[PDB]
């Protein structure tokens, strides 16, 4: 039967126009009090997943 | 419901095929369970018999062997020719076998 969309990926990740995979940076959920403004600021951005990991995630998203 | 038999005891038939092709003879017997007929004088085979009553000499007898009914064709008693069989409903309503060549009855 037809593939099911992995909802964990769908809630974590976006496929961009040219087919990149973008996620929020990790490491600011907590324990933030002694991290610099630069570290809080820079983790506040999205980033482009390394290519092998990106292709694995894209296969979990067949109907985007 | 029945084995269709285009030939009867004991009308006259041509053996149209086989070793005895061309022979004309009387249908001695009809075997529906075998779709065969026996034709007088045709298909004579030598059967061996043990000494006994009926054959105190032993030896052999002659027997007419059966013929597959499709090798046989009635000779129409009107025109005397071998023919396929047609059906015809009489005035009373009964159906009889008639001759495809002329139209005569074959009984």
């Amino acid at each position: 039967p037809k593939m099911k969309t992995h909802k964990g990926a769908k809630k974590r990740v976006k496929i961009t126009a040219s087919g990149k995979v973008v996620a929020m940076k990790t490491g600011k959920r907590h324990l933030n009090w002694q991290k610099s403004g630069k570290e809080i600021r820079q983790k506040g951005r999205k980033f482009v997943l390394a290519k092998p990991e990106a292709e694995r995630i894209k296969l979990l998203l067949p109907y985007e | 419901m029945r084995v269709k038999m285009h030939v009867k005891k004991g009308d006259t038939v041509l053996v149209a095929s086989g070793k005895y092709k061309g022979r004309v003879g009387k249908v001695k017997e009809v075997l529906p369970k075998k779709y065969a007929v026996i034709v007088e004088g045709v298909n004579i085979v030598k059967k061996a018999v043990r000494v006994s009553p009926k054959y105190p000499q032993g030896g052999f007898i002659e027997k007419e062997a059966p013929l597959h009914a499709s090798k046989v064709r009635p000779i129409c008693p009107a025109c005397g020719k071998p023919t396929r069989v047609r059906k015809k409903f009489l005035e009373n309503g009964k159906k009889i076998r008639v001759c495809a060549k002329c139209g005569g009855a074959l009984d």
């Binding site: 992995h6 974590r12 996620a23 990790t26 997943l49 694995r56 979990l60 | -």
Partner: protein
Amino acid sequence: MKLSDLRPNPGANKRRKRVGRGPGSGHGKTATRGHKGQKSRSGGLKDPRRFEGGRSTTLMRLPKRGMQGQVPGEIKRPRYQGVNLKDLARFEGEVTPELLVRAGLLKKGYRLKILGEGEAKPLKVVAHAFSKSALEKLKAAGGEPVLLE
């Protein structure tokens, strides 16, 4: 042309790869699976798109973000699809949402919004919405924007 002359082009019908049918073929015995281990087995291997040998996976270590929704689900609100000016040049007189739907440009069940990529024609366009740039261009090539609902 005869029945016996009908044939596919070269490469149109390739023959299948058949494994485990002898030493000559390059695929005999192990059938290209290698030696032992999971994955050589009938049924082998967890989903390679996700599973990573027991450690936390690349996916699940990334954080969640955004509204995920909640029961009773998606909130009904008006939706917009955008059609650019350049895709209006095939049209004469007056473009409509229904006409744009017929052409294959606009999807059913989507309110119409005109966008500014391309150039404006002297057309009377009837749309639910217009970008600023799509208005100026249209209201400058002699076009007649018709906002509506």
